[PDB]
XYZ file of C-alpha atoms in Angstrom:
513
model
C -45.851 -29.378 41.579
C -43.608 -28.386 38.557
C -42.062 -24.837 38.988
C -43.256 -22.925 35.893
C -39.899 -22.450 33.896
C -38.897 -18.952 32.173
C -37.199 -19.385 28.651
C -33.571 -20.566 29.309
C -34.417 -22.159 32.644
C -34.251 -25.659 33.760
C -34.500 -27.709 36.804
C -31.328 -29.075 38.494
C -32.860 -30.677 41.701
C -35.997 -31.659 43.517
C -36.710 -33.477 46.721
C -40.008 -35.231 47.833
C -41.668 -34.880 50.717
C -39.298 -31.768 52.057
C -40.750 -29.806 54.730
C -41.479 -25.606 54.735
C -41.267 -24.509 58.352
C -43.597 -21.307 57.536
C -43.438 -18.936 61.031
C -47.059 -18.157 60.211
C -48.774 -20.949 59.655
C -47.273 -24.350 60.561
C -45.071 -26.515 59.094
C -46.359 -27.888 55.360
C -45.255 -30.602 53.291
C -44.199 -30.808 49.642
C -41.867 -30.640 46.539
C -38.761 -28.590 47.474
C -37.667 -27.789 43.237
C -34.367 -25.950 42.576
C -33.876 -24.869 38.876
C -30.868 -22.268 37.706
C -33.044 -19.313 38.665
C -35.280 -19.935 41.561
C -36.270 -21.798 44.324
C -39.235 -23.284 44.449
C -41.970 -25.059 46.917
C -45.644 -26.103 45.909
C -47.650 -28.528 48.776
C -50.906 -29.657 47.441
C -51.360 -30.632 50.554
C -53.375 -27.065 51.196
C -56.389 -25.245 49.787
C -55.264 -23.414 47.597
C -51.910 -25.126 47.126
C -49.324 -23.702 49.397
C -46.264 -21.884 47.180
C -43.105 -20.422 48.125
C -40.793 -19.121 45.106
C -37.952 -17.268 45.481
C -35.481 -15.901 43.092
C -31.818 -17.623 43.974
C -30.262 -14.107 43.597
C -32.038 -13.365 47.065
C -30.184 -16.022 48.806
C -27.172 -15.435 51.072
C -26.186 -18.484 53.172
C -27.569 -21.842 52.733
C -27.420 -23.514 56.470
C -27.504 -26.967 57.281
C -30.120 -27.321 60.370
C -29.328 -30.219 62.697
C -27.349 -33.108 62.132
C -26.956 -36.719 62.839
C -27.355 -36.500 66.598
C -31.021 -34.868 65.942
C -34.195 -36.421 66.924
C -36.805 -33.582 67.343
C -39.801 -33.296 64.654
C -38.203 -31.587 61.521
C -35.111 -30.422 62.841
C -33.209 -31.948 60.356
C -32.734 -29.649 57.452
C -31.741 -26.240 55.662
C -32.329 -22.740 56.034
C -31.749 -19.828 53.333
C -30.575 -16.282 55.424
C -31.927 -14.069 52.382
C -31.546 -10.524 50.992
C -35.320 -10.583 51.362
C -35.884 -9.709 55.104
C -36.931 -12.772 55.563
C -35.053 -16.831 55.790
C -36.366 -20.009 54.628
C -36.170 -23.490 57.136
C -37.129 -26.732 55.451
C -36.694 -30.016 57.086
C -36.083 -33.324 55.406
C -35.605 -36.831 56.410
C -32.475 -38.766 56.669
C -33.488 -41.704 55.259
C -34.558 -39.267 51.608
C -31.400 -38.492 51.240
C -31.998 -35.456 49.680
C -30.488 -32.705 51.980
C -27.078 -32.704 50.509
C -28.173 -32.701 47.129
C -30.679 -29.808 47.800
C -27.763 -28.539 49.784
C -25.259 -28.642 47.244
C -27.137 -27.647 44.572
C -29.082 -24.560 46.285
C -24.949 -23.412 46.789
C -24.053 -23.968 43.423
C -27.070 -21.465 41.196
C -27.638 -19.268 44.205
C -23.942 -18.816 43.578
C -23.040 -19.247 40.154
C -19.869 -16.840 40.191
C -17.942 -18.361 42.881
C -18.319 -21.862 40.857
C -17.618 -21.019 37.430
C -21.299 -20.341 36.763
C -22.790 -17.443 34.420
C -25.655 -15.894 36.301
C -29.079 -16.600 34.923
C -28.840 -12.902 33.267
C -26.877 -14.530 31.088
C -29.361 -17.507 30.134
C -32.669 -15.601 30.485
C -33.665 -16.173 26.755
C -37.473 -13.877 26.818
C -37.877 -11.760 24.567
C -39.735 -7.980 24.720
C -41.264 -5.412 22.485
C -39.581 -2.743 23.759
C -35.776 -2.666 24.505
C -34.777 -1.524 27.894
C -31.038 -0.688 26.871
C -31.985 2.076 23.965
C -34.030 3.625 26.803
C -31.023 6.137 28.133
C -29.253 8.356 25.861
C -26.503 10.173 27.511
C -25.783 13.369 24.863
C -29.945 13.554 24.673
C -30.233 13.472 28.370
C -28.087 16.340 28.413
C -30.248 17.987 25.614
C -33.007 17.951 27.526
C -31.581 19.683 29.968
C -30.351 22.235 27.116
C -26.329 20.709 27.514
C -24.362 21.670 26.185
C -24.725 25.754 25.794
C -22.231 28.933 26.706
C -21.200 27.778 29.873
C -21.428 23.819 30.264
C -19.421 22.007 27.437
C -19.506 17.853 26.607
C -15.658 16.371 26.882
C -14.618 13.449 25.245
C -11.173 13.334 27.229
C -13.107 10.355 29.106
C -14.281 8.367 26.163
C -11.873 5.614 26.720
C -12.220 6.010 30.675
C -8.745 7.104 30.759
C -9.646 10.000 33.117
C -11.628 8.036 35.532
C -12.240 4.676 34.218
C -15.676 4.065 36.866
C -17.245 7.552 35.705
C -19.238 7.624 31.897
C -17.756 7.989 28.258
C -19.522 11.656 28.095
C -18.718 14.226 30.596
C -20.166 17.897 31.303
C -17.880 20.630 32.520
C -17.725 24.129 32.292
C -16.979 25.659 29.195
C -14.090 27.361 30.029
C -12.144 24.271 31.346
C -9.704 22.738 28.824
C -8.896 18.689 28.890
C -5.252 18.926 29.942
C -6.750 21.082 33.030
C -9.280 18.156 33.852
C -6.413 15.863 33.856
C -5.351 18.034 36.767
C -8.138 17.796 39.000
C -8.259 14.215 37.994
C -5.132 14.083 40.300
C -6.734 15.808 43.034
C -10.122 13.922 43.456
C -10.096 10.603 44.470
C -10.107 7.493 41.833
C -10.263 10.647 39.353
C -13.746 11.428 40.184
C -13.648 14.595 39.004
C -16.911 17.218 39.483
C -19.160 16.835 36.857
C -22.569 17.952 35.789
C -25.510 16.311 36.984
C -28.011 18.723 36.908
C -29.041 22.205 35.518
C -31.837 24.509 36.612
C -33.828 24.878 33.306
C -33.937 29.226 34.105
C -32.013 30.115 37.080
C -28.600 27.711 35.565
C -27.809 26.940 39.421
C -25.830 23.461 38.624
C -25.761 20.370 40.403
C -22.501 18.369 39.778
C -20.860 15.061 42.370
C -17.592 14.170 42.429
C -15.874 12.286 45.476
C -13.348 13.541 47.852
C -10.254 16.270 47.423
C -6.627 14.790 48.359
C -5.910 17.046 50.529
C -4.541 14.833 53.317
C -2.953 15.409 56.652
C -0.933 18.244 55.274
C -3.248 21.156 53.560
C -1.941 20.354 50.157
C -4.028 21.887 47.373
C -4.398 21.749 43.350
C -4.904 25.209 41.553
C -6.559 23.262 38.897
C -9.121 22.008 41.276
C -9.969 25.666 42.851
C -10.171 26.940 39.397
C -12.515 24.108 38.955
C -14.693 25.040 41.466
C -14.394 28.697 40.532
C -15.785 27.808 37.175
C -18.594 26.428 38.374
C -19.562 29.257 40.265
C -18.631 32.065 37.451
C -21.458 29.941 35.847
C -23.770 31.004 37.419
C -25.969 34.774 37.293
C -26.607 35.143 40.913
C -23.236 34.317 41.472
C -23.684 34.297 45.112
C -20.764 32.082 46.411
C -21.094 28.174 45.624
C -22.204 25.309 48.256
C -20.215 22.428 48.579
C -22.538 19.225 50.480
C -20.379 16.534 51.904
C -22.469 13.559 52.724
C -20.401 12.563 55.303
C -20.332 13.162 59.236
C -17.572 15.776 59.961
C -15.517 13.497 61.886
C -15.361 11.180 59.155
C -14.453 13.470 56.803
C -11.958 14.302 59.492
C -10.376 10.511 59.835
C -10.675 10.444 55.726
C -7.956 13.498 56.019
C -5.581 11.479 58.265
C -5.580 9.023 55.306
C -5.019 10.935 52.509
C -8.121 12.353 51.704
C -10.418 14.923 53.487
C -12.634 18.144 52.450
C -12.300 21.441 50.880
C -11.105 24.083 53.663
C -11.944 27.923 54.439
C -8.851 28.555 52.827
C -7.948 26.580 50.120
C -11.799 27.392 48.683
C -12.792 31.150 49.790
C -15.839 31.179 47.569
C -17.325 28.285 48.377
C -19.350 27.042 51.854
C -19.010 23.568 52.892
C -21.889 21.534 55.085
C -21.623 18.288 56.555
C -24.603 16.146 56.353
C -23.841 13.474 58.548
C -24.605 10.546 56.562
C -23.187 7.530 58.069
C -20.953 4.868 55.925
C -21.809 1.627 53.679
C -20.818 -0.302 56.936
C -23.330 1.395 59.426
C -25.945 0.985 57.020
C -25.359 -2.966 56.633
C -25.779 -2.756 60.349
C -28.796 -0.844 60.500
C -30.554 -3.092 57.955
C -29.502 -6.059 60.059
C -31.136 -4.873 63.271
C -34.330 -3.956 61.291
C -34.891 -7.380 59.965
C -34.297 -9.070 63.565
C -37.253 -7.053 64.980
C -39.301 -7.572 61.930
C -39.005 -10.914 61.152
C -40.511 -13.351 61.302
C -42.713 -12.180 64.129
C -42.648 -8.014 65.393
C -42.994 -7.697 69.169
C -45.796 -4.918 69.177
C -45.205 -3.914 72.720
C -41.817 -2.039 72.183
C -42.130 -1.524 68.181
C -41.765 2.115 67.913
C -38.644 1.872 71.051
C -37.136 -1.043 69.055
C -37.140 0.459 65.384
C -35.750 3.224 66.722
C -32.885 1.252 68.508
C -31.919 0.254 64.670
C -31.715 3.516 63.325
C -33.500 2.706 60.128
C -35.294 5.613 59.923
C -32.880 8.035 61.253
C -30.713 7.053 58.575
C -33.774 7.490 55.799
C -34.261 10.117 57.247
C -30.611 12.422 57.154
C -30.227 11.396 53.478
C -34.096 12.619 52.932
C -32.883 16.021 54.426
C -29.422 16.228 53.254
C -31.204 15.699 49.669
C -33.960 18.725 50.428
C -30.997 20.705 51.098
C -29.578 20.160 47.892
C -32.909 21.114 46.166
C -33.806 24.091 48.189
C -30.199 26.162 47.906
C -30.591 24.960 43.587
C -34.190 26.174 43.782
C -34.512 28.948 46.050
C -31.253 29.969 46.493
C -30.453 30.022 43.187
C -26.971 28.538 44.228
C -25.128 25.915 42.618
C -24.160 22.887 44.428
C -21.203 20.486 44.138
C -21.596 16.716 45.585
C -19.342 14.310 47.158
C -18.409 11.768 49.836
C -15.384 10.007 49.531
C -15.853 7.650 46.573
C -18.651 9.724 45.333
C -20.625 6.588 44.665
C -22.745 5.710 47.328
C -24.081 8.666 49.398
C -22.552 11.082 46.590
C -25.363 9.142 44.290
C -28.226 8.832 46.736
C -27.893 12.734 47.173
C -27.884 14.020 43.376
C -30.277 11.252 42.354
C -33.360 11.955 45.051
C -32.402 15.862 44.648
C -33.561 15.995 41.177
C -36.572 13.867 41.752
C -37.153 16.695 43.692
C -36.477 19.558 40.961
C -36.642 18.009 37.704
C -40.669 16.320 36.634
C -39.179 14.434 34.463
C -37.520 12.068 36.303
C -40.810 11.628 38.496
C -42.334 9.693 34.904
C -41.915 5.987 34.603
C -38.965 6.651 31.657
C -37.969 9.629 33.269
C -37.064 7.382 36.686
C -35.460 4.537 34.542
C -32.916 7.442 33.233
C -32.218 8.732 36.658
C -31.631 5.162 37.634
C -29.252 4.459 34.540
C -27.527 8.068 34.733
C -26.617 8.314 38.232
C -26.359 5.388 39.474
C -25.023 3.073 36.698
C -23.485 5.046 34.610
C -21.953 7.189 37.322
C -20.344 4.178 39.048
C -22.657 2.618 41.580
C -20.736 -0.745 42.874
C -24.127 -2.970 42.399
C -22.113 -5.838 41.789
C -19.675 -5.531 44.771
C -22.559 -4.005 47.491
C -25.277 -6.566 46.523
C -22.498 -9.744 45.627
C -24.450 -11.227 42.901
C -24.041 -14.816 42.717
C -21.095 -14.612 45.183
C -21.132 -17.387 48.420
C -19.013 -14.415 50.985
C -21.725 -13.503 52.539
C -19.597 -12.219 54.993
C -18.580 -9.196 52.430
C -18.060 -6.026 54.088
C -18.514 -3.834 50.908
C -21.848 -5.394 51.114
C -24.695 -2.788 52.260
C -27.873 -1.863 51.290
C -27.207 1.416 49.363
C -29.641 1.456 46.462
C -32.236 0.096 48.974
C -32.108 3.484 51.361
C -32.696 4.915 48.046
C -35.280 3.129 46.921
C -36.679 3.421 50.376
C -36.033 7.510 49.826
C -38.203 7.515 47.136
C -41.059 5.715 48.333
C -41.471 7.829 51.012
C -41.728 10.717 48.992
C -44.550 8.453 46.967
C -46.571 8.851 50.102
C -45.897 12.367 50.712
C -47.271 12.928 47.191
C -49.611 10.121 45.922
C -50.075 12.162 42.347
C -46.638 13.468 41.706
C -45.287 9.955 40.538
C -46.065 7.984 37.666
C -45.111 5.137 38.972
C -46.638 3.138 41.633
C -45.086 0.777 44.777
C -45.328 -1.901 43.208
C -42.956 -0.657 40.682
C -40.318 0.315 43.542
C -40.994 -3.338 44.730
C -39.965 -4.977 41.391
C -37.473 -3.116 41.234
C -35.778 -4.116 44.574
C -36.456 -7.855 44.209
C -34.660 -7.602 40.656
C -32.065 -5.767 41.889
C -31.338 -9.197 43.308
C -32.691 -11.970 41.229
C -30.098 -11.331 38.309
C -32.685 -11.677 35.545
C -31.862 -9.071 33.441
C -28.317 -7.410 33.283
C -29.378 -4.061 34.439
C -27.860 -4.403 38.069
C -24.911 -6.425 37.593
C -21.527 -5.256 37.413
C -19.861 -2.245 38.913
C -19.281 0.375 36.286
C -19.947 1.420 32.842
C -17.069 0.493 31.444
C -17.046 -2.940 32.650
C -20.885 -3.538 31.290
C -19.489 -2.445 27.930
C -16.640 -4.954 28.120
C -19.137 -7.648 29.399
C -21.236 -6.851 26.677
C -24.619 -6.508 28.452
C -27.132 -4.958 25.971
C -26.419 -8.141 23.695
C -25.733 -10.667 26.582
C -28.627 -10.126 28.837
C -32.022 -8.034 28.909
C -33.027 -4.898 30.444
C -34.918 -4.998 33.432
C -36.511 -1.717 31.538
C -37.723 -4.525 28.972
C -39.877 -6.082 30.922
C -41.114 -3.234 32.867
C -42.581 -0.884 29.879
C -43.677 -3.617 28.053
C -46.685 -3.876 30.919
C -46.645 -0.473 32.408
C -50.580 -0.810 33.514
C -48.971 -2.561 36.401
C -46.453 0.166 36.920
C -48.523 2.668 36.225
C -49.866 4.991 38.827
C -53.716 6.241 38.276
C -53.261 9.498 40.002
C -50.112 10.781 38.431
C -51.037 13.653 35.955
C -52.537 16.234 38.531
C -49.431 18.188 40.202
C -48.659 21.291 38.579
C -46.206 22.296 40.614
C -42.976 20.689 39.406
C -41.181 20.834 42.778
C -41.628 17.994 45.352
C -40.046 19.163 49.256
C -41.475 16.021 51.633
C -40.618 16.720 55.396
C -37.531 14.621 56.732
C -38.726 13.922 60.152
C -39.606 11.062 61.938
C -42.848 12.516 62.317
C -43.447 12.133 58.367
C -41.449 9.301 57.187
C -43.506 5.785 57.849
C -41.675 2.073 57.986
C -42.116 1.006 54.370
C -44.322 -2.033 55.428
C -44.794 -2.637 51.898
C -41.141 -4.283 51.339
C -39.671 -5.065 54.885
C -43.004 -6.717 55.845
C -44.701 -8.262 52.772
C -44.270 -11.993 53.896
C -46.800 -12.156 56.903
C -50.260 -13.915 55.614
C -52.005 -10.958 57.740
């Protein structure tokens, strides 16, 4: 049957009598329909109708399946490797004729960008009550958290992104820091990631602030400006007990980083300060890890060795170390009273999976439906997240290695601490959920590009709609029933692999049970 089209869709191929290889229930005949958004497949030849639709954004390689010399019962065809933990195998026949052209054009709107394309963000014409982009207001944000007062101040020095052009247009530092001073430090951090505020206790003022590695390469060199900095931040606070310093990274990364230019604040170079590792692998282990997940649980899981072979992959180790590097954030803010400063060595991956799931942690408000939205679009957006680059919308290299799933561990992060604490959230799974499998469809403009700067160049909030748009315009299907009940306004889930559970719900969603 006809694929039901969203405003600004249309088809651009179809094929007849194309095959669906499903691993669970046989192969099925029907209409194979490709439109500039999805793919769809709809057999009538079931009870109810068997349908498959999948958003092209999912799709990573398009493979042709057998060729010529192929005689076998449908094993002439195409499978789509997708995003999705899962691939799609259809067959067709030779004498249709309608491989290549399924072929073809399954490689030209799953992958718009590399031919000229605008992704279908751009041609998504619905429109919502509510308006998804007026949802985050930076200076307000900060309001809420009582920023600016006596000891944080609001900079403009970045407004043009001149001091860091991937950080936002407003920037929180401490009061006593003057602009030609940030330029300093500017020199000192990496990309000109500079610390900056994050997070503020609302009584104690311990601060949260990220920033990405010091340049303090093979030879100790330091910056005055940046010590100061750090000084600052700790003169900030009343129980100005020394400051903590949490690099995401595994010490002999950190290590290697220093051998090429980079590195980690010393004993020496920062005497008030204490620095912990938290041995958080890179973008490149994670891809790896993900990979190794999917090949155990899909399409079929081996149930004799499960529990040995998940833990061959690492999955949940790796949830796990960024669960407790994040606790350890909260816990020194919260109970110790001690202000924290973030990094990695971009500051943009791990640095953002840390400060972000660390104030879900300390701050309610970011547990509500709007409140999560603003975490989302404050530290990871606006802060400089690389969606663009680590998912590579509408991009055929599949082979990308700045490709890994970053915001999904995060995701992932936060689920777990859904079931840890079924009332203390707002929203529900199945808000998580749509938020992952937008993160790759490319339907609204919320996830696309790769820093705040460039979304104001590319125009979003008039180009494309917020994913926010669609979401709180239907929040009874977002909304959790038992949210309202936790008094307590500090979440600390366990990070073992006692506690943390295999989130069935997303990696294994496709088996008909």
């Amino acid at each position: 049957e006809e694929p039901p089209l969203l405003p600004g869709e249309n088809i651009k191929d179809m094929a007849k009598d194309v095959t669906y290889i499903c691993p669970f229930t046989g192969a099925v005949r029907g209409t194979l329909t490709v439109t500039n958004y999805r793919l769809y497949f709809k057999s009538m030849e079931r009870d109810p109708p068997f349908v498959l639709d999948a958003s092209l954004g999912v799709i990573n390689r398009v493979e042709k399946i057998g060729g010529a010399s192929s005689r076998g019962e449908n094993s002439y065809g195409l499978e789509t490797v997708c995003k999705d933990i899962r691939n799609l195998r259809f067959a067709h026949k030779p004498e249709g004729r309608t491989r290549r052209s399924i072929f073809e054009n399954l490689m030209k709107y799953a992958f718009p960008v590399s031919n000229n394309l605008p992704l279908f963000a751009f041609e998504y014409k619905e429109v919502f009550p509510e308006n998804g982009w007026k949802l985050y207001d930076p200076l307000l944000e900060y309001r809420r958290q009582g920023i600016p007062n006596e000891s944080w101040r609001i900079t403009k020095i970045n407004e043009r992104y001149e001091l860091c052009d991937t950080y936002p247009a407003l920037l929180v530092v401490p009061a006593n820091i003057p602009d030609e001073e940030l330029k300093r430090v500017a020199s000192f951090r990496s990309r000109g990631r500079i610390p900056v505020l994050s997070w503020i206790h609302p009584e104690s003022q311990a601060t949260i602030t990220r920033c990405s590695q010091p340049m303090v390469g093979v030879s100790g060199k330091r910056s005055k400006e940046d010590e100061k900095y750090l000084q600052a931040i700790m003169d900030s606070n009343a129980q100005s007990h020394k400051i903590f310093i949490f690099d995401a990274r595994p010490s002999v990364n950190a290590v290697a980083n220093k051998a090429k230019g980079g590195g980690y604040e010393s004993e020496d170079a920062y005497q008030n300060a204490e620095l912990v590792f938290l041995d958080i692998h890179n973008i490149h282990v994670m891809r790896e890890s993900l990979r190794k997940l999917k090949e155990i649980v899909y399409p079929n899981i081996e149930e004799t060795h499960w529990l040995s072979n998940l833990e061959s992959t690492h999955w949940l180790e790796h949830i796990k170390l960024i669960l407790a590097g994040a606790l350890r954030i909260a816990d020194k803010v919260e109970s110790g009273k001690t202000s924290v400063v973030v990094h990695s060595s971009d500051g943009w991956d791990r640095t953002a999976q840390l400060t972000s799931l660390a104030m879900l942690m300390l701050d309610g408000y970011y547990r509500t439906i709007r409140g999560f939205e603003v975490l989302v679009e404050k530290e990871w957006l606006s802060f400089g997240h690389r969606f663009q680059l680590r998912v590579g919308h509408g991009d055929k290299n599949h082979a990308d290695a700045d490709r890994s799933p970053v915001f999904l561990q995060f995701i992932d992060c936060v689920w777990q601490m859904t079931r840890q604490f079924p009332t203390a959230f707002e929203f529900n799974e199945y808000f998580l959920i749509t938020i992952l499998d937008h993160l790759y469809s490319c339907l609204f403009g919320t996830f696309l590009c790769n820093s705040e700067q460039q979304r104001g160049k590319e125009n979003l909030p008039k180009r494309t709609v917020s994913l926010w748009s669609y979401i709180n315009s239907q929040l009874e299907d977002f909304t959790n029933p038992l949210y309202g009940s936790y008094s307590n306004h500090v979440l600390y889930p366990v990070a073992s692999m006692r506690h943390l559970e295999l989130w069935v719900g997303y990696y294994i969603r496709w088996n008909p049970r």
